[PDB]
Design a protein around this ligand. Structure first.
Ligand SMILES: CC1(S(=O)(=O)N2CCC=C(F)C2)CC1
Ligand SMILES: CC1(S(=O)(=O)N2CCC=C(F)C2)CC1
Ligand SMILES: [Cl-]
Ligand SMILES: [Cl-]
Ligand SMILES: [Cl-]
Lengths: 695, 697
């Protein structure tokens, strides 16, 4: 059920041992010595990775190394669709703007931070959560010249439990991380968008990198003279596999959770955040689908935007299903009622007062938050011409010297980015007409962005006429209209431009709403400090984990399937047979790599097939993961790598508020399938040879 | 494979059924010379199956089986289709016009009789051995002089089995006063609606209740206010013990058609002509309908039923093609014929290999014609609504070219025009469907093979299908109401003879009939060769593990209550529960609305004796029994012959089961009798129905 601090391993070890953990406590996490924790990395600031060899070889997800695979892909060498397999270390490709972070040391600095905070004076100061304040405290504790005296190292203090616990992290950052291997996109992204958040899953979501360092193993930026890093710890790869009920554990960097949400925050998340996103994205996607189906060129241009909009749309449907069916609201209400009853018995009213504060803040910001999500989903992300060019003060105070020509070239560059190869003005007019019709129905005249008042005032409520007029009269309505403006540019024309007035107007309202809503975050945050303090003083930091905050956590559970609906069971493991079942050569998402199809046909599975002779692909577990856990190592009872976490099922997206024991599963790619692809698809024996594989 | 057996075959199957869990005595299930459970099975309304469940002629069948009767008694005041119907006294049970219930009184093997009569051969190619007229003349000869008058209510029928190698005479008792007694609301009776059609897991309460009425002596009689409920020879006991995984289950019913003795060439043809054309043309048709229904809520109202009707056989063809592709249907037919050919060679009898060769040669020879037939049938005859636009008859045309019969001909044409262009017909949607359907048709069928009017696309319109379709509506008398009324005011035969829509409709129907008439002669050689082929198969392996094709006659099937794995890592269990209904609830979707009385029963856990050991309320179960169309409403029996459910469907992974049964995929979808009795009790409040049934603990 939790994403536990490394400090909490001692207090959990007995339960983990009872659940099947066989390895020694300090072999997994040692606060003053080398442990498995030392083989886990924060890959590129978002994902998780793991060192799997004495030469700094790193495994992470395909979707984690995707941008690096794309940056090295050309028409001649398409590594994104064909995969990449460096046959020698010298062929491994460097990547600009990449990093891996090791968590060298972690220390509890709560009493230190709390004593330093006593000098605040203002009781409403948000410095207790300030990265700038906490960094000044971190520097004070580590030393004046710490990073110079210890090169490659850095320190960081973070708040936990709403400001009730502080930890200082000593981090080692490496920035020369080279691409080593990757399967074709047909394996690394088999499900593509259709199987996103879906279990059963048949995706071989992996990519291989290598950490490079100076001659002494110290961090260094890219240099042709850099040598592979020899790390203090790396994972052994297990080929024993997984069985139903086997103990499994994960270490990674989960980003965010909302485990201490009040019932009023769950109602708000449902009725504002989720309902608006679901409603507006359904209108948007519905118009895009009609147009993509009727024009193959519109399908080419809008496919990525349609898919990108569907991602959080699906997430919201999954989250709303949990709120409706799993009693998320009720369990938060039972949590706060229990604390309020305990606080009454103790004579301490501050907990009930803190919950009341959160409820009152949520109730007070309701109309503003609704208006914010309405403009964000409806216009800011719903209508493409909302992001059309807005002339800067420097650009207008240049049009009215040959600085007119420089201003027009800056505006033209922005206009070409807006109206690009994938932009259709006709599709955008249709999307805007349906999105604005819904927006104008939900937001009243007095609350409208100033230009949208023209729908009622100038166009007699004709949204189609208003949108037609924007394009017919705007200098950004067509290339010919822009070139006619660029030939005779007047600031007066730009000041009255219907598209510029629309774009400026909707961005004014969006910022006015954001700035009005920001002050409401602080009272909730301060009240959460008292609320979480109350929950911990009552039931303890034992069965209630601190919210995820992009810091190193461990989670444990078992390899186990689940029943999604009545009379249906999804088992714990997928096989290569499921990939072949899903094959569709006329659907880009489900095309099967010919080399992999041949391996399956010839049953050339080597030492990677299971006891039944079937080739495993992926498995699922009752571990508690969220975003940030992509690429996380999955370990055996002995701490051996059995897979890489790459997703979680949709029935568990509400797991960031309330973990769902009977539905929530981590979707992991089986390490045996990883090695099978490296071996039989990539032919990269050198990678297999440098890993320590156990029978 | 795992058959639909003749009642005659129960004797030689009994030992296997007993070993599979059957506990009842052989003759208690079927006895040719006495009362048996077979006597409680009926052919409900000529298509479905039913079963007598009380000593007062109460009958259970499916909701989709009694649907037309429930609809005929429904008005905007007493809507029985939407709210259900529960007659609180026998006098309140509603009579139904044109309904029937057929009992199978006796069944007799008349093979030697028919085969001896057939020896009086005028031609060895005579198809009389399969002729309903010929076999009826033989049936009447055996039964006697005016049998129907001497034995009222009774009738006799001879049917061919095993391709003409076995004949059975059936003595049938027909009752035509069958009254509606009870029915759940449509929200239960068709819970899945079209979404869950052919789907397992399934949560549908597919049942309806009727009653057989007869004269004072229990003899068949048409509706009369003086008719009294039938006291039957035999009725089923209802079991409340339920079902468990692996339990023995059996069904009796009237499966309609199977193709178990198809050659590999017939499976290839079924796939590449029948199924591929139906899939291709229906996808074009449905695609255009969907775009129009989504853009106009009034077009959704008008085209919803046509869209759903087209999707039905479309989905079935997708499921059938999946089995051909994944379950080795072709290969198993090839292995069947290769094995017979090898055995025939060893015996010195070449007639079996010659018979298979005949079938293959006929299939290869009719390929282009059959492709052209399915192309015009799926593409135009079904695909385009103005293909069924009015065509003036020879006598209608004649009446227009000097009497008061001109106004009679115009009123007949107007009546047909109003039926074509009705409240659900949109000329704009039809022009769009026709433009896409004809574009595909013209791409597949060459100029020399086109219906004569479709040649105008190339000749007169320079290949512009949109212009050709636009011209048909712009110039036709049936293109709009105003165009028709202008014709009706000044009707000339010359105008009708040149009408572009009339010429299109006539032209496509000419080609459709020319193709049908050319293809008909090819059925006979295949049929005659199948007589030799099935004779060989039976002489080689026996009528023991190869059942005769279904032909709308009484059959039994047995298996077990068992689920299956549809795909990797997914298991569908053997039983659905009331929780699955509540999980599927969607108040803003007519298909998944949950009846308020039922939702509260679930909330209250008011399940009585109808819940399982764990306290869960069962809804439906599935079994490895071999069923097909005609088996809707079939009784499902226990090891003891007690009613445990009613068959109402089969899963799509098993639609290829009519050619080859699929042990690991094919399941009969049955509504649990405990859920039937729960709905009668807690939703209908009809205690009198529960009281007249014999329910066992
Ligand atoms: C809309 C759904 S989905 O498309 O299955 N979806 C999958 C991806 C993520 C989710 F959260 C949900 C039925 C719930
Ligand atoms: C995509 C499919 S289907 O075509 O909707 N299916 C529906 C039920 C009847 C069938 F025969 C097939 C599931 C296979
Ligand atoms: Cl290291
Ligand atoms: Cl012979
Ligand atoms: Cl099978």
């Amino acid at each position: 059920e939790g994403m536990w601090l490394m400090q909490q391993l001692g207090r959990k070890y007995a339960q983990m041992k009872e659940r099947g953990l066989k390895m020694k406590e300090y072999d997994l996490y040692n606060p003053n010595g080398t442990s498995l924790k030392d083989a886990v990395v924060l890959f590129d600031g978002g994902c998780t990775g793991e060192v799997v060899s004495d030469r700094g070889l790193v495994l992470t997800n395909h979707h984690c190394g995707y941008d690096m695979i794309q940056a090295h892909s050309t028409l001649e060498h398409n590594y994104l669709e064909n995969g990449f397999w460096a046959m020698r270390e010298a062929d491994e490709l460097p990547n600009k703007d990449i990093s891996v972070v090791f968590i060298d040391k972690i220390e509890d600095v709560t009493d230190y931070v709390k004593k330093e905070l006593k000098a605040i004076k203002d009781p409403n100061s948000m410095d207790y959560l300030s990265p700038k304040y906490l960094q000044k405290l971190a520097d004070k504790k580590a030393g004046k010249n710490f990073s110079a005296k210890n090169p490659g190292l850095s320190v960081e203090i973070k708040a936990f439990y709403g400001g009730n616990l502080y930890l200082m992290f000593t981090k080692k950052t490496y920035t020369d991380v080279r691409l080593v291997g990757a399967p074709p996109s047909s394996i690394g992204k088999f499900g593509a968008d259709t199987d996103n958040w879906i279990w059963p899953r048949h995706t071989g979501d992996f990519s291989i990198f290598r950490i490079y360092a100076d001659k002494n193993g110290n961090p260094a930026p890219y240099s042709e003279d850099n040598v592979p890093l020899k790390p203090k710890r790396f994972f052994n790869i297990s080929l024993g596999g997984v069985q139903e009920n086997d103990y499994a554990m994960i270490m990674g960097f989960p980003g965010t959770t909302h485990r201490y949400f009040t019932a009023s925050e769950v109602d708000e998340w449902k009725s504002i955040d989720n309902d608006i996103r679901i409603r507006m994205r359904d209108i948007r996607q519905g118009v895009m689908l009609r147009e993509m189906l009727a024009d193959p060129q519109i399908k080419i241009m809008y496919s990525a935007k349609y898919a990108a909009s569907q991602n959080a749309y699906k997430r919201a449907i999954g989250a709303n299903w949990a709120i409706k069916t799993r009693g998320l609201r009720q369990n938060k209400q039972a949590m706060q009622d229990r604390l309020i009853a305990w606080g009454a018995k103790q004579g301490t009213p501050r907990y009930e007062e803190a919950v009341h504060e959160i409820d009152a803040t949520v109730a007070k910001r309701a109309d503003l938050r609704r208006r914010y999500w309405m403009i964000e989903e409806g216009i800011i992300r719903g209508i493409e011409f909302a992001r059309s060019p807005i002339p800067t003060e420097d650009e207008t105070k240049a049009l009215q010297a040959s600085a007119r020509k420089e201003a027009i070239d800056k505006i033209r560059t922005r206009y070409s980015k807006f109206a690009n190869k994938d932009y259709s003005a006709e599709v955008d007019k249709k999307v805007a007409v349906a999105m604005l019709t819904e927006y104008l129905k939900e937001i009243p005249y007095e609350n409208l962005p100033l230009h949208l008042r023209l729908v009622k005032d100038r166009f007699a409520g004709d949204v189609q006429a208003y949108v037609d007029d924007i394009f017919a009269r705007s200098v950004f309505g067509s290339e010919a209209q822009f070139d006619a403006f660029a030939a005779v540019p007047s600031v007066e024309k730009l000041a009255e431009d219907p598209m510029v007035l629309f774009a400026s107007s909707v961005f004014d309202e969006y910022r006015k709403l954001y700035n009005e809503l920001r002050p409401y975050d602080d009272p909730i945050l301060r009240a959460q400090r008292t609320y979480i303090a109350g929950l911990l003083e009552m039931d303890g930091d034992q069965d209630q984990f601190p919210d995820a905050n992009l810091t190193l956590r461990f989670t444990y559970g078992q390899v186990k399937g689940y029943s999604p609906r009545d009379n249906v069971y999804y088992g714990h493991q997928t096989t290569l047979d499921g990939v072949m079942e899903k094959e569709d050569p006329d659907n880009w998402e489900f095309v099967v790599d010919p080399k992999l199809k041949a391996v399956y046909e010839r049953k050339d599975f080597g030492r990677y097939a299971d006891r039944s002779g079937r080739m495993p692909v992926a498995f699922c577990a009752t571990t508690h993961t969220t975003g940030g856990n992509s690429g996380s190592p999955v370990m055996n009872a002995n701490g051996e790598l059995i897979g890489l976490n790459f997703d979680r099922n949709w029935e568990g997206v509400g797991g960031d508020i309330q973990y769902l024991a009977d539905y929530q599963r981590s979707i992991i790619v089986d390490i045996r399938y990883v090695l099978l692809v490296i071996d039989k698809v990539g032919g990269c024996q050198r990678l297999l040879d440098e890993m320590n594989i156990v029978p």
